[PDB]
Amino acid sequence: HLPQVLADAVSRLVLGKFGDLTDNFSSPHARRKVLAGVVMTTGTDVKDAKVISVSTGTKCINGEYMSDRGLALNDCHAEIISRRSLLRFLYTQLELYLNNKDDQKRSIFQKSERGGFRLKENVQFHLYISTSPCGDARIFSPHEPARGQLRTKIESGEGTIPVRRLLTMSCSDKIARWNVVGIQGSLLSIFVEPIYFSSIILGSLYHGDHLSRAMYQRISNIEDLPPLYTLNKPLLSGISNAEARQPGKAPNFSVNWTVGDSAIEVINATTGKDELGRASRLCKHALYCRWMRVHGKVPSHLLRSKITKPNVYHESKLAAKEYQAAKARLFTAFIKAGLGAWVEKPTEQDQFSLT
Amino acid sequence: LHLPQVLADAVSRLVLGKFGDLTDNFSSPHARRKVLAGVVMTTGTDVKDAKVISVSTGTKCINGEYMSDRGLALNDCHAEIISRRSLLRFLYTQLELYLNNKDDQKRSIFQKSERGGFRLKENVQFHLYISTSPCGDARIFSPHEPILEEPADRHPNRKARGQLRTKIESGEGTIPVRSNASIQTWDGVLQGERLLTMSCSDKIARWNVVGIQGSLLSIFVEPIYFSSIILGSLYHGDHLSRAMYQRISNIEDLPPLYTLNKPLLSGISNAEARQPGKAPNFSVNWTVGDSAIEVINATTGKDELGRASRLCKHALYCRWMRVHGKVPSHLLRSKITKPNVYHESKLAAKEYQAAKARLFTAFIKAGLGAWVEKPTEQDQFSLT
RNA sequence: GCUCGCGAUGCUGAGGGCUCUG
RNA sequence: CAGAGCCCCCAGCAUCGCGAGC
Ligand SMILES: O=P(O)(O)O[C@H]1[C@H](OP(=O)(O)O)[C@H](OP(=O)(O)O)[C@H](OP(=O)(O)O)[C@@H](OP(=O)(O)O)[C@H]1OP(=O)(O)O
Ligand SMILES: O=P(O)(O)O[C@H]1[C@H](OP(=O)(O)O)[C@H](OP(=O)(O)O)[C@H](OP(=O)(O)O)[C@@H](OP(=O)(O)O)[C@H]1OP(=O)(O)O
Ligand SMILES: [Zn+2]
Ligand SMILES: [Zn+2]
């Protein structure tokens, strides 16, 4: 209960954890334009909240530097990187369940009636972003009392343009996408049921009408979702002491951290790789490694989708047929509302193996 | 009035004088300025025939946060920019005047044109005053009073010469356009990308091609040009001639009536003095017929109380719609139909849009950069 | 004459603090 | 709430020198 107290706690917890990871904000990698994070709650408590993930970044990869081997991060906007960090947590929580019977009590996952795994009662995830996400949620005049267009991130800069190959969808559109197909992605949907954010908390440029349109209301025309998939309508809130616009140059790097990690990981938004040119623990390849390790531990009869001898990344995603159908329904709802066609990257980029 | 320097001195004197009348002989708190500008209309040979159309002050552009998706905010409060917008109100009033009755046709500056719609009566000219050199190419390389002992520009073949330049939010310095960076966005500017505004040197060059009336008025009237640009200080003839026209002498394939205008360029006999103190945050505007100046917070693009200027895009669109309803179809210079959306209505000025296109290509072909526009969302509004 | 890098001295819209004032 | 005076601080130009390329 009390939306504004939750909002404040989530905002305070994520900022607090960012401090600890940056020598109380004094490290050069505390330099950020947008801060994001995910907080998990367990029961209608107060302070039984855990920061799951902490991220920064405002920039995307140049085309020259795109990987056809899953070694490069395509999108380093804080909120996108915070989701990917949550995927690392969810793989860890599946290994916790699977590695020892006595650890099943400590995992957020339990066996589901319907097959594979689902969350335990009252396990919720909350998204913090220090500003409203790029795209439709940020197309207004904050000093003033055709909308819902899908938008793409512009090659160089930090903002978006409407649509009608090398192009990334806005954060406003990706969170709307997460409010249909879940936050967990295609590959995790093979082990676990759809997972939604209960709350989206903004640290600035909060606006109830614009954010609700961006996040779900523009696609309430959505049709015939498979079972467990809903149009999720999370709690939307700003925070009590909002953050001021700081006009200037925006940093070139993106920070990420997941609960359990000893240190932040610093990526170059331009290359999608860390400062020494190695692959992130968040890239397609690294998440596919986590997924493959869990696929090795889960008996065939316990999968929510059939998939034996997984090799190519793209094939393994196509096996999540509930998810691919809810994605189709999503792509249709935007078209029929007159809001544009989702830009998908050419699926040679996902044609790689762990060979 | 026929001698370049007398006209130049009269234009300066009239704008100073009018600004004085409006600020209780410079006593009032809104007399405080760093840069003054104005438009004077001559309707013939004698000083009697000189009328001040507009007066403005200001040195500042809007803060990114305060951009209005309804066109209720002034984006650029550089004096010379505000003085042109004040002229636009005069031109709308003068069109409504012609249309009012047959008596009034005689007292309008406009007559029906042989080629459709309206044009100026013979010998109606406009003259722009700025108390200093316009920011960008006319100013950046020598923003100080000229000195006899200083021998003009020693390095006129430098790449930096003639370049399109932007004012940059929170940054001093008028900065070239670069090819690596691209398109400004609404969402980018709100979260803190610095808002870029094209320099006044670049905007007056534009006016010497597409005219001063803008896209909307071009649907009713033929292109209007400044006959003179007069600087009350920091006059440097070689930088100003380059900035105002000579750098895009390469421009081609202009629509009919559009041309590369080469206005008289001049300083004055007794240069204006450096205005003392900190640059005020407000911009003043006045058009002939107004009872008083309007004061705008240039940081917000609105007045002290948050109300829109008589000069904001919404007020100009409102003026255009009112005239649009009194001009019969057969007097339109353009028959192209567009939705009553600010952006869309400007696209009915097909010839103006083609002249803008030629302008942009000429800056690019000359190696002087690509023009930087506001985010496309700015002008996506309607009346109410 | 231009371009690039280095050095030097200068030039030209923000943020912060102190003081006074309305 | 606003304004001013003073200090502090934050991407282009000028001038001169050094090196190189054209
Ligand atoms: O975190 P993101 O940057 O938003 O990454 C997503 C994510 O890809 P990965 O999990 O492999 O990195 C989507 O994967 P799933 O929803 O299938 O789990 C995928 O979408 P599809 O593979 O379903 O097509 C793709 O998006 P897209 O192909 O639509 O461009 C991509 O987004 P980016 O390409 O923008 O990184
Ligand atoms: O130079 P300003 O007086 O500030 O105004 C101009 C003017 O816009 P408005 O009359 O609506 O304010 C131009 O419009 P036109 O009259 O030439 O049609 C427009 O250019 P576009 O029409 O191409 O939209 C735009 O310039 P831009 O979009 O290049 O930024 C803008 O300049 P500002 O944005 O700086 O105010
Ligand atoms: Zn984003
Ligand atoms: Zn200017």
Short mmCIF file of C-alpha atoms in Angstrom, two decimals, chain A residues 5-18 39 46-47 51 128 239:
data_model
loop_
_atom_site.label_atom_id
_atom_site.label_comp_id
_atom_site.label_asym_id
_atom_site.label_seq_id
_atom_site.Cartn_x
_atom_site.Cartn_y
_atom_site.Cartn_z
CA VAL A 5 6.19 5.56 0.22
CA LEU A 6 7.05 2.54 -2.02
CA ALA A 7 8.22 4.96 -4.80
CA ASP A 8 10.42 6.85 -2.27
CA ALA A 9 11.84 3.58 -0.72
CA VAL A 10 12.67 2.12 -4.22
CA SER A 11 14.30 5.43 -5.39
CA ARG A 12 16.28 5.73 -2.08
CA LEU A 13 17.36 2.00 -2.15
CA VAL A 14 18.65 2.13 -5.79
CA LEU A 15 20.49 5.47 -5.22
CA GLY A 16 21.91 4.13 -1.91
CA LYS A 17 23.26 0.99 -3.67
CA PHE A 18 24.71 3.11 -6.52
CA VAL A 39 14.00 -3.66 -6.36
CA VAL A 46 8.04 -2.29 4.61
CA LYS A 47 11.88 -2.83 4.47
CA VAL A 51 18.08 -4.03 -4.75
CA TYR A 128 13.32 2.68 -10.94
CA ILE A 239 9.29 10.62 -6.25
#
